[PDB]
């Protein structure tokens, strides 16, 4: 019933940015960029010169630098959404596991081993204020 209270609990979740309205309006140009890479003609033009392609989408400097550096965490900070952004790492020929592991600061090998063993435990990463 209370939209404000419904959005505020999302802030207590560790290591997670929920794709709320405020992020969606922020990332609009960055997520529509990523959508254009569904078309093969756009993929090949983008790969021929990233920076000129990026300059047609009107990204903030922080968003464009995030793309060029392939820093998925910075891209999400500028309003990027993992499912629109999945078009970019697929353009690069990378898997969703690669992408996800590249946001954790583990090496690819450790992240793959962690999954084999059962994945990351919920213990300690449910609540910023509780600590559990």
């Amino acid at each position: 019933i209370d939209v404000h209270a419904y959005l505020a609990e999302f802030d207590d979740i560790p290591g997670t940015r929920v794709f709320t309205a405020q992020r969606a309006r922020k990332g609009y140009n960055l997520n529509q960029f990523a959508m254009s890479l569904m078309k093969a003609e756009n993929r090949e033009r983008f790969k021929a010169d990233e920076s000129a392609y990026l300059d047609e989408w009107n990204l903030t400097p922080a968003a464009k630098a995030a793309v060029l550096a392939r820093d998925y965490n910075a891209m999400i900070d500028e309003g990027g959404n993992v499912y629109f952004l999945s078009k970019l790492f697929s353009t690069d020929g990378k898997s969703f596991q690669f992408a996800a592991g590249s946001m954790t600061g583990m090496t690819q090998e450790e992240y793959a081993q962690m999954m084999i063993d059962g994945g990351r435990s919920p213990a300690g990463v449910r609540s910023i204020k509780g600590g559990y």
Binding site: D12, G15, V82, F96
Partner: protein, 298 residues
């Protein structure tokens, strides 16, 4: 004109990529494809193969971009092409819809006060086609018609778990008033616990997923009141895809039998789950074994 069976299934893209590259039998993927085998052998049986599947899934920013975000949509077209998600169009046959039943169901849901969006053109992403590949293999054409039923869980808020369970009950009602005697399935795709973004990517919560499976069978009405914050906190930011298992679930009656449950960790970033449910009154025999839990942690 009857809903005989409810199936759920994870729709992880790396599954359609193990098939494409011929590695679906290596050591990582092998146990996954094997846990789907009892579903493939069950569904080809005469009387088990659906005429039409109502496939409930979340579009992953494929058919829908930031400009048009429908809460609930239904595909009423005759054909749907596999979407190009960055790798080129998935090399599987086009999905054939059923326009007379799809349009009957859309008119019926709006009469029942769901604010539906009718789609007459749309590409179907991995949400929809990976489960077809896992369950039907690699035929030249899919063996049945499919009605794609995309649900938003990308931009918040998604529909409540309460909204979703009620919707599956009105889908059942509209299939029952369709005057042909069709064998109709509802599938829900997605899940189970996973997180694709951020420093907490990798999150897997097998306690949450196994209790989810339990309650979905025996007390879905209670499970329907779980708020979104609980999915998010406990099963990862993409765990919210499990709201669609509730749509499938509300299309079956109060009493169901579970014929088969597969649960495996990991498959790419996620805990993979797949289940077959039938109304207890008309259910077949469960499979043997009835429940399979795989992967090194299990």
């Amino acid at each position: 004109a009857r809903v005989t069976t409810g199936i759920t299934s994870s729709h992880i893209p790396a599954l359609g990529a193990a098939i494409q590259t011929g590695t679906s039998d290596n050591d990582y993927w092998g146990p996954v494809f094997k846990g789907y085998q009892p579903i493939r052998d069950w569904i080809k049986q005469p009387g088990n193969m659906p005429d039409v599947v109502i496939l409930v899934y979340n579009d992953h920013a494929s058919a829908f971009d930031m400009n048009i975000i429908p809460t609930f949509a239904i595909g009423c077209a005759e054909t749907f092409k596999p979407a190009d998600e960055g790798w080129g169009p998935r090399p599987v046959p086009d999905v054939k819809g059923h326009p007379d039943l799809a349009w009957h169901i859309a008119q019926s849901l709006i009469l029942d006060e769901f604010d539906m969006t009718i789609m007459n053109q749309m590409d179907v992403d991995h949400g929809c086609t990976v489960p077809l590949s896992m369950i039907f293999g690699e035929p030249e054409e899919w063996p049945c018609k499919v009605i794609p039923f995309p649900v938003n869980v990308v931009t918040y808020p998604p529909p409540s778990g309460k909204r979703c369970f009620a919707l599956g009950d009105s889908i059942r009602a509209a299939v029952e008033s369709f005057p042909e005697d069709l064998n109709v399935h509802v599938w829900g795709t997605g899940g189970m616990s996973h997180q694709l973004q951020g420093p907490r990517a990798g999150l897997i919560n097998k306690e949450f997923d196994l209790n989810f499976i339990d309650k979905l069978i025996s007390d879905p009405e209670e499970l329907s009141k779980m708020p979104h914050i609980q999915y998010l906190r406990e099963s990862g930011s993409e765990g919210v895809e499990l709201v669609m298992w509730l749509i499938m679930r509300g299309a079956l009656p109060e009493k169901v039998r579970d014929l088969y449950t597969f649960y495996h960790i990991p498959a790419s970033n996620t805990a993979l789950g797949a289940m077959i449910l039938q109304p207890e009154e008309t259910a077949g025999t469960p499979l043997e074994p009835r429940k399979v839990m795989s992967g090194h942690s299990l």
